[PDB]
Design an enzyme around this catalytic site. Sequence first.
Site, PDB file in Angstrom:
ATOM      1  N   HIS A  93       0.856  -1.177   0.000  1.00  0.00           N
ATOM      2  CA  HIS A  93       0.000   0.000   0.000  1.00  0.00           C
ATOM      3  C   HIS A  93       0.895   1.231   0.000  1.00  0.00           C
ATOM      4  O   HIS A  93       2.044   1.173   0.442  1.00  0.00           O
ATOM      5  CB  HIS A  93      -0.923   0.018   1.219  1.00  0.00           C
ATOM      6  CG  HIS A  93      -2.119  -0.871   1.083  1.00  0.00           C
ATOM      7  ND1 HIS A  93      -3.092  -0.669   0.127  1.00  0.00           N
ATOM      8  CD2 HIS A  93      -2.495  -1.971   1.777  1.00  0.00           C
ATOM      9  CE1 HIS A  93      -4.017  -1.606   0.241  1.00  0.00           C
ATOM     10  NE2 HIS A  93      -3.678  -2.409   1.233  1.00  0.00           N
ATOM     11  N   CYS A 104      -0.244   2.794  -4.530  1.00  0.00           N
ATOM     12  CA  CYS A 104      -0.982   4.042  -4.696  1.00  0.00           C
ATOM     13  C   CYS A 104      -0.059   5.195  -4.337  1.00  0.00           C
ATOM     14  O   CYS A 104       0.813   5.053  -3.480  1.00  0.00           O
ATOM     15  CB  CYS A 104      -2.206   4.092  -3.774  1.00  0.00           C
ATOM     16  SG  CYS A 104      -3.644   3.153  -4.333  1.00  0.00           S
TER      17      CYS A 104
HETATM   18  C1  LIG Z   1      -3.832   2.343  -2.953  1.00  0.00           C
HETATM   19  C2  LIG Z   1      -2.897   1.175  -2.812  1.00  0.00           C
HETATM   20  O1  LIG Z   1      -1.896   1.270  -2.125  1.00  0.00           O
HETATM   21  C3  LIG Z   1      -3.174  -0.125  -3.521  1.00  0.00           C
HETATM   22  C4  LIG Z   1      -1.954  -0.532  -4.351  1.00  0.00           C
HETATM   23  C5  LIG Z   1      -1.734  -2.029  -4.326  1.00  0.00           C
HETATM   24  O2  LIG Z   1      -1.128  -2.552  -5.285  1.00  0.00           O
HETATM   25  O3  LIG Z   1      -2.156  -2.702  -3.359  1.00  0.00           O
HETATM   26  N1  LIG Z   1      -4.369  -0.085  -4.354  1.00  0.00           N
HETATM   27  C6  LIG Z   1      -5.569  -0.474  -3.913  1.00  0.00           C
HETATM   28  O4  LIG Z   1      -5.771  -0.890  -2.783  1.00  0.00           O
HETATM   29  C7  LIG Z   1      -6.710  -0.377  -4.895  1.00  0.00           C
HETATM   30  S1  LIG Z   1      -6.900  -1.926  -5.712  1.00  0.00           S
END
Ligand SMILES: *CC(=O)[C@H](CC(=O)O)NC(=O)CS
Lengths: 173, 173, 88, 88
Positions: free
Chosen positions: B113, B161
């Site tokens: 994340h 993200c």
């Molecule tokens: C926002 C994020 O950190 C993640 C990135 C990941 O590859 O886990 N994205 C999501 O949680 C949306 S699918």
Amino acid sequence: TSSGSEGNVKLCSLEEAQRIWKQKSAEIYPIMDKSSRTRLALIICNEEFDSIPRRTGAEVDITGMTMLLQNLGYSVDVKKNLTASDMTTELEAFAHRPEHKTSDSTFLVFMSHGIREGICGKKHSEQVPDILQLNAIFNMLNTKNCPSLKDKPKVIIIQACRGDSPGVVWFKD
Amino acid sequence: TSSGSEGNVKLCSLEEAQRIWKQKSAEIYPIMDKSSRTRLALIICNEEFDSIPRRTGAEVDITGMTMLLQNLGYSVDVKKNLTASDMTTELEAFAHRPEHKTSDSTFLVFMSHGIREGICGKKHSEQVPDILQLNAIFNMLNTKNCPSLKDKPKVIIIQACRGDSPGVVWFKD
Amino acid sequence: AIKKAHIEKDFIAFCSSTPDNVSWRHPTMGSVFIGRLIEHMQEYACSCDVEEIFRKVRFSFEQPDGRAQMPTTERVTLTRCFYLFPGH
Amino acid sequence: AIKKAHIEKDFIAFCSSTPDNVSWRHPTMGSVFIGRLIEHMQEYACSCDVEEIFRKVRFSFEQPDGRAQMPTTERVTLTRCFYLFPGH
Ligand SMILES: *CC(=O)[C@H](CC(=O)O)NC(=O)CS
Ligand SMILES: *CC(=O)[C@H](CC(=O)O)NC(=O)CS
């Protein structure tokens, strides 16, 4: 000859231009008709400051870049000695220029003192910071804030310190 | 065949390898002897977190990248579910690895994340941040802190993200 | 009808040094990064896309002296090659 | 004897999206950026340097859907082309 509009910039010949368009596929940015296109470029150069030392030799930089961008076919706006607020205002005005709609690309040039956080405005001091963040330049020129340059190359050039370090380390040979 | 060490990665033939070395000048990174070189790669993947949602499907990413980097000739270190402090420690340990001296390049992969400020550690929450800054990754692997990889390509890949926005805007056609 | 577009795309930034580090300027010769960029643009715009040209500029700085800097390409979202096609 | 070297050089970072923006991941298919990168590495490592490959990955994301992202190359100090020469 350097007496032409492209000055000292070496010319791409038609055979060269056809070869680049041939060797590589449809992954080159399209160029607009020379006859109708209205290419725009902006140079912001801070030379004279309120508190920080004078940027002697900035004139050579302005001249060089201005001529170069004109040689490449861009109409060049040159703005000097602005606060971070003024730079933002100037950038916003540049993004709203109608010529971008009939342009295929743009160049943005920033030349000033700089710190780790960004580019120094004319009124900058350590006590009262006057900084334009690189982040803000992208935001003001992106698709939301500058729809006219959607799908078009936006080239940002920055002459500035990014901190105080010499950027070197020693090793023995 | 995919039964070889390079798996599904398309092979560069000797004629292809000589042509790349010929067409372009001495502006390609040198490759070390296959027989003696010790290429290293690190994957840090955070899947299970204390507070934030579970990164379901991380296994597919780890497998894919691990195999790919092995196919390209890298010995792959895989470390899972670490705090920002642990990641830093792991990066420091990677920078000190003797194999880099007899390597010609490296890959670093981070999968977790992320927020605008950087990559989330296992213990991350909004109340108590646990963030590794991209800035720190470069610093730990630069010439001062990792002299063994001086003049050698260091490729950083980050799946995360970089904020909350969808990254889109509307326009009419 | 309305269509989605990436908010940020087709950007390339080129900075005069790496983060934390100084960029040099001569009182009569100007900024080294700017002069080097002009030189490289003038020579290579005909045959190389901007990403290629910028790499060559970085390469020209490779050997450090008393006033050393390493120009850095940042936040690149060019999806195609950008050729200037000088003369066209 | 001692010699000067650039503190930061020969780096390339490749992020899954542009700053401020989300990157997408499927529960069974994995992260789209990672899968797309593997695919492109597998296909193009033989003929293209990493900068070229990364551009192609960006291009593959060009048409946005409901889950859109634009991968971004950052802090690039590669002074040469980096070819993987797979098989060698
Ligand atoms: C926002 C994020 O950190 C993640 C990135 C990941 O590859 O886990 N994205 C999501 O949680 C949306 S699918
Ligand atoms: C640190 C700086 O901002 C400037 C950059 C410039 O081009 O003026 N560098 C110096 O003042 C050292 S010459």
